[PDB]
């Protein structure tokens, strides 16, 4: 039994090349075949790579698959990036002890059409409303911290949605009892975007 | 032991 | 020509059984594996199992713990995914896919999912028609910043106020001041 970890988001301008890597937690990545699936918005997935590096008919050669045993990773490389490649990509392998299929968490590939934008964060104070707005690419990670202890219960986060200006917006809600609000000294919303964290506290 | 092809056969092969 | 047709969307409630289908057209249904992939809204792909319809030989994900059944009727070239008792967590899109197998340039066989259905959307919510409660619209079903579909099955959004919910016939004008 193993896991396949994938970056949440990657981005690049049209025409250049991107790589999405998929690290296996235990055992050799080269002991079991690796497949890569593509899923555009509102569409069913399709296989772009199978058996590590084989491409099904109709998939161009700008898509290529590789295996690095030293890092225990598989990689999907897309050259000559086109706007139609914007999509979620998934790696997948097999666990022979139970014949199970293990999938990666998925990676959203955005083809940069406009300059990157940092997220504007606003934390309203029981339900805490962390509004995140006017950011590009459309991928953020929200983390709620009560003082110093992490919290993952009672969190409802939107999926980023295209704004009117072709930028993205999202919102997170942390539901709590009035006692939880009055008990702690402060709560904090942390928005991670392109490796930069914006933290607001109340 | 089994290479990747033998594992795929073990997973999916069916005699017809 | 070859296609997989999945049953239409289903909106059910907890405790209801369910049985969704996946019929193959244009090929020998009984000689290819049919796999079921779950995708909960806004999340990643999850493999739930496989059935070889020729002999109805089934494989399951370790994490199903008997909740669901994967079956087949090859007289009508159909595969089935079945729930005895639905739960809110089961809300998701459910794809079926054919495991194609051809011969490579080496003479050996290879397998991969070449053919997909459009997916059956299964919503499992207890939410009844309710009116709602900057401003913070809270718990309003059915819709209509985009709204979050909370774990309670109800929607909530925020606008940065005059709110109108015709499904419940609720018009509320709130006055915001420090």
């Amino acid at each position: 039994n193993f896991m396949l970890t994938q970056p949440h988001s990657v981005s690049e301008s049209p025409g250049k090349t991107v790589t999405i890597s998929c690290t296996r937690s235990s055992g050799s990545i080269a002991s079991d075949y690796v497949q890569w699936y593509q899923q555009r918005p509102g569409s069913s997935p399709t296989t772009v790579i199978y058996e590590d590096n084989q491409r099904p008919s109709g998939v161009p050669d700008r898509f290529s698959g590789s295996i690095d045993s030293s890092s225990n990773s598989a990689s999907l490389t897309i050259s000559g990036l086109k706007t139609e490649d914007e999509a979620d990509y998934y790696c997948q392998s097999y666990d022979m002890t139970n014949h199970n299929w293990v999938f990666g968490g998925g990676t959203k590939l955005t083809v940069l059409g406009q300059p990157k934008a940092a997220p504007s964060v606003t934390l309203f104070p029981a339900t805490l409303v962390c509004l995140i707005s006017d950011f590009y690419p459309g991928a953020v990670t929200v983390a709620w911290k009560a003082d110093s202890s992490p919290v993952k219960a009672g969190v409802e986060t939107t999926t980023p949605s295209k704004q009117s200006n072709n930028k993205y917006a999202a919102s997170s809600y942390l539901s709590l009892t009035p006692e939880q609000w009055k008990s702690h000294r402060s709560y904090s919303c942390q928005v991670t975007h392109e490796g930069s964290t914006v933290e607001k506290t109340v | 032991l089994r290479d990747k092809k033998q594992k795929a056969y073990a997973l999916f092969y069916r005699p017809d | 020509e070859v296609q997989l047709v999945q049953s239409g969307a289903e909106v059910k409630k907890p405790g209801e059984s369910l049985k969704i289908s996946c019929k193959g057209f244009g090929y020998s249904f009984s000689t290819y594996w049919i796999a079921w992939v779950r995708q909960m809204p806004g999340k990643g792909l999850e493999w739930m199992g496989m059935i070889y319809p020729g002999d109805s030989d089934t494989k399951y994900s370790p994490s199903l713990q008997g909740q669901v059944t994967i079956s087949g009727d090859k007289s009508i070239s159909t595969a089935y995914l079945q729930w005895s008792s639905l739960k809110a967590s089961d809300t998701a899109m459910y794809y079926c896919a054919r495991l194609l197998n051809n011969y490579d340039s080496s003479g050996f066989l290879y397998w991969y999912l070449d053919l997909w259905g459009r997916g059956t959307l299964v919503t499992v919510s207890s939410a009844s028609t309710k009116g709602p409660s900057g401003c913070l619209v809270k718990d309003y079903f059915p819709e209509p910043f985009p709204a979050v579909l909370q774990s309670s099955g109800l929607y909530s959004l925020s606008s940065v106020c005059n709110v109108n919910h015709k499904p419940s016939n609720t018009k509320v004008d709130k006055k915001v001041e420090p």
Side-chain angles (χ1 to χ4, degrees), chain A residues 30-33 51-52 99, chain B residues 2 4-5 7-8 10-12:
Chain A
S31 61
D32 298 294
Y33 277 135
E51 284 191 4
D52 308 325
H99 287 197
Chain B
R2 308 180 293 173
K4 294 173 199 166
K5 274 287 185 188
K7 291 173 180 182
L11 286 172
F12 306 132

Side-chain angles (χ1 to χ4, degrees), chain B residues 5-16:
Chain B
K5 274 287 185 188
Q6 287 178 14
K7 291 173 180 182
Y9 272 70
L11 286 172
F12 306 132
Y13 184 83
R14 281 292 178 287
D16 47 346

Side-chain angles (χ1 to χ4, degrees), chain C residues 7-20:
Chain C
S7 49
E10 306 268 28
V11 187
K12 299 230 168 172
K13 299 175 176 294
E16 295 190 306
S17 61
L18 176 64
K19 192 188 187 182
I20 60 179

